[PDB]
Amino acid sequence: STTEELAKTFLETFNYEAQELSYQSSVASWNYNTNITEENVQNMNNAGDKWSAFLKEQSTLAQMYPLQEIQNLTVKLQLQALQQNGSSVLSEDKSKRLNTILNTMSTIYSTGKVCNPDNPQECLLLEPGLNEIMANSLDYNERLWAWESWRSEVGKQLRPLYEEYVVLKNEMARANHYEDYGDYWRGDYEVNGVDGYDYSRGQLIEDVEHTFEEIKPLYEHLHAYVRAKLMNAYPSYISPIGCLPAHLLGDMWGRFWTNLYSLTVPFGQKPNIDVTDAMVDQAWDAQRIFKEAEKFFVSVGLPNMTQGFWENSMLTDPGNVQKAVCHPTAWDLGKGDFRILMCTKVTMDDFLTAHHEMGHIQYDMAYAAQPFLLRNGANEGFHEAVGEIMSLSAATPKHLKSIGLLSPDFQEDNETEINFLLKQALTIVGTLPFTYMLEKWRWMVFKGEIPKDQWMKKWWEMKREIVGVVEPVPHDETYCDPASLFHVSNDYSFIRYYTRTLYQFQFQEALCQAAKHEGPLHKCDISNSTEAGQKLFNMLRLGKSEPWTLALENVVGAKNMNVRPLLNYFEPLFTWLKDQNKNSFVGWSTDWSPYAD
Amino acid sequence: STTEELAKTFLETFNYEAQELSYQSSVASWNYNTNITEENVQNMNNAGDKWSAFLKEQSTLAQMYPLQEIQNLTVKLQLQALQQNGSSVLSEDKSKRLNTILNTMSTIYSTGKVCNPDNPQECLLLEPGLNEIMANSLDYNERLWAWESWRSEVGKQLRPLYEEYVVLKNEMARANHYEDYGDYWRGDYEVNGVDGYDYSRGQLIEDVEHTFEEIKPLYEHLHAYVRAKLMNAYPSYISPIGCLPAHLLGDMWGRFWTNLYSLTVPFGQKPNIDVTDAMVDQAWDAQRIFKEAEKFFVSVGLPNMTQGFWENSMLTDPGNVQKAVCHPTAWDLGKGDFRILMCTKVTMDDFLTAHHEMGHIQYDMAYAAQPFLLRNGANEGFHEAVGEIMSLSAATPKHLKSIGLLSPDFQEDNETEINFLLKQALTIVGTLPFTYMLEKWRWMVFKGEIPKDQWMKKWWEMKREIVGVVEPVPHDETYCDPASLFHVSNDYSFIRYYTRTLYQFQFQEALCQAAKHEGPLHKCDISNSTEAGQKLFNMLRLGKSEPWTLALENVVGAKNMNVRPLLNYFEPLFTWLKDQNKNSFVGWSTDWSPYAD
Amino acid sequence: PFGEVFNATKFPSVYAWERKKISNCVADYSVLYNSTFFSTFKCYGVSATKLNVYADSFVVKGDDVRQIAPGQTGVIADYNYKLPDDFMGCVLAWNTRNIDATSTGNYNYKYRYLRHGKLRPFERDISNVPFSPDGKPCTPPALNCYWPLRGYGFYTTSGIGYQPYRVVVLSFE
Amino acid sequence: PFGEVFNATKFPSVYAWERKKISNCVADYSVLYNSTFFSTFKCYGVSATKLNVYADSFVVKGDDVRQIAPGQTGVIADYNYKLPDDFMGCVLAWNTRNIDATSTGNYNYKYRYLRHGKLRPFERDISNVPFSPDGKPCTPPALNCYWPLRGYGFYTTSGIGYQPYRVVVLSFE
Ligand SMILES: CC(=O)N[C@@H]1[C@@H](O)[C@H](O)[C@@H](CO)O[C@@H]1O
Ligand SMILES: CC(=O)N[C@@H]1[C@@H](O)[C@H](O)[C@@H](CO)O[C@@H]1O
Ligand SMILES: CC(=O)N[C@@H]1[C@@H](O)[C@H](O)[C@@H](CO)O[C@@H]1O
Ligand SMILES: CC(=O)N[C@@H]1[C@@H](O)[C@H](O)[C@@H](CO)O[C@@H]1O
Ligand SMILES: CC(=O)N[C@@H]1[C@@H](O)[C@H](O)[C@@H](CO)O[C@@H]1O
Ligand SMILES: CC(=O)N[C@@H]1[C@@H](O)[C@H](O)[C@@H](CO)O[C@H]1O
Ligand SMILES: [Cl-]
Ligand SMILES: [Cl-]
Numbered sequence A, B: 001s002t003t004e005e006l007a008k009t010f011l012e013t014f015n016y017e018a019q020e021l022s023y024q025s026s027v028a029s030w031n032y033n034t035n036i037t038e039e040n041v042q043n044m045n046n047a048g049d050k051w052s053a054f055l056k057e058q059s060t061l062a063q064m065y066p067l068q069e070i071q072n073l074t075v076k077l078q079l080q081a082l083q084q085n086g087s088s089v090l091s092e093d094k095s096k097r098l099n100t101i102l103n104t105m106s107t108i109y110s111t112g113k114v115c116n117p118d119n120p121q122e123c124l125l126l127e128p129g130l131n132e133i134m135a136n137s138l139d140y141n142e143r144l145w146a147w148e149s150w151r152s153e154v155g156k157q158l159r160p161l162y163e164e165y166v167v168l169k170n171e172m173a174r175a176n177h178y179e180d181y182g183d184y185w186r187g188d189y190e191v192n193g194v195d196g197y198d199y200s201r202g203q204l205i206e207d208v209e210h211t212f213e214e215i216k217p218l219y220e221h222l223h224a225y226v227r228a229k230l231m232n233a234y235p236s237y238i239s240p241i242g243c244l245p246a247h248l249l250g251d252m253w254g255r256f257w258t259n260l261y262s263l264t265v266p267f268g269q270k271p272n273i274d275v276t277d278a279m280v281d282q283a284w285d286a287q288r289i290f291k292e293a294e295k296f297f298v299s300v301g302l303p304n305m306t307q308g309f310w311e312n313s314m315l316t317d318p319g320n321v322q323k324a325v326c327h328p329t330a331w332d333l334g335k336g337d338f339r340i341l342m343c344t345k346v347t348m349d350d351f352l353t354a355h356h357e358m359g360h361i362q363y364d365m366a367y368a369a370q371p372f373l374l375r376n377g378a379n380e381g382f383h384e385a386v387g388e389i390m391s392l393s394a395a396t397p398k399h400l401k402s403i404g405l406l407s408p409d410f411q412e413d414n415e416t417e418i419n420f421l422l423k424q425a426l427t428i429v430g431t432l433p434f435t436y437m438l439e440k441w442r443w444m445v446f447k448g449e450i451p452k453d454q455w456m457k458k459w460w461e462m463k464r465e466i467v468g469v470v471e472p473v474p475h476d477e478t479y480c481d482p483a484s485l486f487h488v489s490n491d492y493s494f495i496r497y498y499t500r501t502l503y504q505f506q507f508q509e510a511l512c513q514a515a516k517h518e519g520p521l522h523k524c525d526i527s528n529s530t531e532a533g534q535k536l537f538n539m540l541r542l543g544k545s546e547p548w549t550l551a552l553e554n555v556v557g558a559k560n561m562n563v564r565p566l567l568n569y570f571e572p573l574f575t576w577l578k579d580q581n582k583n584s585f586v587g588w589s590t591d592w593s594p595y596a597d
Numbered sequence C, D: 001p002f003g004e005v006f007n008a009t010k011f012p013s014v015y016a017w018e019r020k021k022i023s024n025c026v027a028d029y030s031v032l033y034n035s036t037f038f039s040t041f042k043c044y045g046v047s048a049t050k051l052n053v054y055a056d057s058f059v060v061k062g063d064d065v066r067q068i069a070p071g072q073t074g075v076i077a078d079y080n081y082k083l084p085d086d087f088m089g090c091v092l093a094w095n096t097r098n099i100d101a102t103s104t105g106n107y108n109y110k111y112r113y114l115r116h117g118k119l120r121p122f123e124r125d126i127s128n129v130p131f132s133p134d135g136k137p138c139t140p141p142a143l144n145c146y147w148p149l150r151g152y153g154f155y156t157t158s159g160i161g162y163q164p165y166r167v168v169v170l171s172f173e
């Protein structure tokens, strides 16, 4: 009859009601994404709103319970999740307007197009068209064109909205007792009450920046090596001591240097670790891919997929006569209903992707025992981390040999190790500075530290300083380049990609330690190990129930995010780089730019 | 013209002369030990005397130099070393008699044989035959026989001589300004003048006994565990609360429990960490063993063996038609002449012993740069310790894999680790008590604290109380059991094997640190670490040119010996032991006997 | 007359389970032995015959079948149907996802999730009175007042533990 | 006439080294170029030819060969044979363990370990006069009186650095 007991009986009703509405919503969202009928877009919104309403109504009611007046770890968590004053904390107009902005920014980005200045007839969308240029084109100017067009068009448009977005979003943040929207976001990493596992919203920046320091040397060398390589691609356009022209990086923003591989490859004479054709030559279908991935998890002591998984999943593009979205996604509908949606092509990329996806599903399964509100990864970085773990083990020539997709011969010579690691750093290491830099600006912009009259002038004061990248054309304030990147002008916390990245390496290490693994860390295949699964499932079964600090500890034995395992994955590379950089300049000068004067 | 200058030119003459006679002596002793011809036993004595004479003549002469009147560290050492009285301090008859005793005892031991009571034709020699029984026989009585015969035969004989040995050797001691021969021996460890680095003859006992107390708990569990196991081997012959029957320990005296492995192994279903058969199965010969250990030292940055080593050494028993002493020895003849003498059998014990022997040789090489009189280990325990350092790294399963005596697979789980630790303890931990107890008994008998009428009472009293062992049959003063062992009746100090074991692990801790080693000390292999290589050689190079306390501090940072490292190396096995012993009595009763029945 | 219990076209909700009495009948039980059509059969007596009984029918979620046994924790066993720690016969169950579940949802089957104090073996509460965790009458929408009866909602694309199961519990006295 | 120097059956002791004068000869030196038979060849000038000399013969311990060069510390170079810091030609040595060394001991080759003051380049002292660290005539066995000359004693089973080495030092002017 105390306030604790009234709360328990409350959450009890919530769980049972959420489960029903939530399930109706997912089954709806799914039906639409797998079958884009007109009727469906209504139903997806039908259940989509009842579910929203329910939460809103529950949140407001869950508000009438003092969690500060609760002696029970678990319940407090659930309540606080529900005590989402949400947008509602604002006012009729503010909340209305804010959503107007959110939706507008989202539409502009997704719908914005740029047209060829000396061919106004043909316009291109960021996907594909533009993106396709930024990933394959070797023409400096064409690449310049895209890069600039996109920021000069959709960018400029989002500026006004992003400005107000920051305002409205901040009022909201402060009203819920945060310093700013940044503080809000950083919240996801917080832990109150447990001792030794507690964690603060400031502690994140502290831990982020200190761990980033220990990354620079590796990055600077990667930077120097690609720089010299780029000089040969675009002779004359690059300074051996200066930053890298942002439009030459492989994608629209340089979020990943993955497409730089074609022209930064250490030994182009080396051959094929790419079983893409080996799979094809074996007449592999979507079925085999997934049955295989199942087998993989089964080997470490994890359960088969549910009979339901095979009954309800969509493992291939239905083609026409039934269009669908193709972003590979792992579905946790609820009511023990699991399935994946993926327009599977017989690529090595897709073979790995399948393991990443089924990783998520395996996670969703493990934590199904948790009360509804705890059924989620420890933090935004956990689920992605667990998926990347999987790609890592399956990618190894050892595993691929084990499967019989790689010739049981094939010597894993000292050179294919480099080719491989470099193509990994280009994606994995290349993104850290960018990702940190991105949230660093965002963060500060919400804390008032970056005046509206010094926004873009600060974006680049930091891209040059932090990322070693420069703007091929200068930008004043009619520009809003950061919002030019999806997650930004779509309201998503970005630092996840950093902490995820660091996590997955700690995981992989602890698991190859557990899988008793001798070789270099990047050749490890947790496959066929059960004490590996165990050490993992031990944290996989928690979801949000505990503090990540504990969940993470359950696998690594650490109470915090650690850079060192990540550096260890690139130790063989790091040394090679330093050597290659023997007579090359390591570092950059912020003052140089490709347009000068 | 000063006294220091007259001295310099003296030692200069000594070194050049000593080198010639000493060399001839060694080449003589070697030629005997490897080819026991008649002519040879003369020449061994020949040069052996010319060398004795030269020293005696140089001793009296060195006397005439006031070292107190010398302001140079080096020379003072050398002189003082020459300023010795040795046997000479006695008389014509005493010194003659003493040597008669020394040689008689030494011959009785080496030449004694026991003949089968119900087979007066076949007799057995301590080595092999007798030793073979004590190392393999599972028969209570056959082992009872051996053990008893040997002490009943050669033992009774030496009793008379040992009694006189004690007298004459004590006079000798006291005449040189010592309390007793015990004080004499304990001398090796002394240091006068340096401050902080001084160490007294009594400090040894103190440090020994104090450090031993801290070893007891570990030994008591090892004891309890092997006891239980032995009860299964010899049903009915052992009391669960009583001491261990001395004839059942695995060698003639129970100096090492190494041969108890076969029937105390924690997990026999594992893949045997005793690579004896592996070696046998792979056709390993003596050359491989030694060439293998050289490779090991080379890997830490030490030199190959000298061409001479390979040409002149004797790495196998010539068999008949050229008998030889088989005690494994490392010869530093002089004139950079180095060789090992070892009747190498393809066993793991031998493979480790090869490393230990070749360690001594490495030490001998490293300090050949030192003036002749400084060419020696810091103290009597340094050489033995350096040899045992090598055995430590080479025994690890990790090294064993590297060598290829263990499957390139082989996953080191936590049971193989107990097995490895249990076996290391059997050898290492098991001798600690046996060694302390032996030296104590002696030290006491030397100090006169033990009357000839109880010589064998107090022995079996301490063998019961300190070691937890018991004579299978009662021994009156007709018996002289300790002399039943080589070192006792061949006039060698023993504590070297205790002090040695402690340094062993101290050195190892520091070395594995210098080798940037991951985790637990017991799993460390310094091979391939030129750094750890360098570190060791740096206190090797020194010879006896330094007080052992300083030299010890150069490598491990401690002025004195400590037991902590040993105890940490054994911790996993310690904790596992306590658990196994939960259903058994831990400790023993001195009151139980296999004959008082 | 067991065919009339097991093959019965419709089953009740656990909160309102049906006890059929059987006396003066002779059955072989073998119409039950020969059945892989059964996902559960845990008896608590034997598995023989005497050709002589209380059959209780209802429906529950797959993961709930575990609670239809002596001792069992709570919710279903606590508030709806509690076997006795004491005596016992058998507990039979079978998946009926194509009978009692639909693609669009089937919420006809109910269960009680709130109450004051647990039920005694074989007790049956069919009351439907607005609940408050501390006595007191109620009047929803009022806060802290909830309706104790709740619908299962069996979707045909759900997990096995979420699919409907018909359960029959035979009791010999 | 070089074969007469190098292939000389017998070489002297260092304290009494032999200097052969070579004038009015023509030698190609190639009979020295083509030789892995030489464990030392340090020249302090060149490695060419003018088809035009002072050959110095003696024997020393392996580890002593290092003193047959300018600068060099002492003992052999100090009291027996000192090359000039100044000018220099070539210094050649070869291992002769099977010629000047015997398993039983070969003490024929001598060297001086005591003296008053160092030698000047190419100086040569062959005196054998009882030595005292302070002037003063001597009479061994008298204390602090030692004979300056001492024998090497070359065993065939010694270390490389203790084995005998024949050394020829060519000097050009
Ligand atoms: C920490 C605590 O208060 N204990 C209980 C816990 O045993 C139970 O599982 C949970 C479910 O409502 O409620 C409370 O959290
Ligand atoms: C002759 C002698 O006593 N040896 C040393 C010598 O090793 C060292 O090079 C020198 C340095 O000052 O001092 C002494 O001369
Ligand atoms: C500078 C000095 O006087 N030191 C010398 C040292 O060089 C030499 O090796 C030693 C040998 O007698 O004597 C002194 O220690
Ligand atoms: C440099 C070194 O010390 N190693 C050499 C090794 O290279 C050589 O092949 C071998 C031949 O006998 O001798 C040594 O082991
Ligand atoms: C202890 C050990 O593994 N030594 C290794 C040897 O195995 C390997 O073949 C070689 C190549 O890098 O390096 C080291 O010598
Ligand atoms: C209502 C609830 O979720 N609590 C249960 C409780 O019934 C159980 O006895 C205990 C396990 O110790 O904790 C939870 O699993
Ligand atoms: Cl940008
Ligand atoms: Cl004994």
Ligand SMILES: [Zn+2]
Binding pocket: A328, A329, A330, A356, A357, A360, A387
């Ligand atoms: Zn994903």
Ligand SMILES: [Zn+2]
Binding pocket: B328, B329, B330, B357, B360, B384, B387
């Ligand atoms: Zn030894």
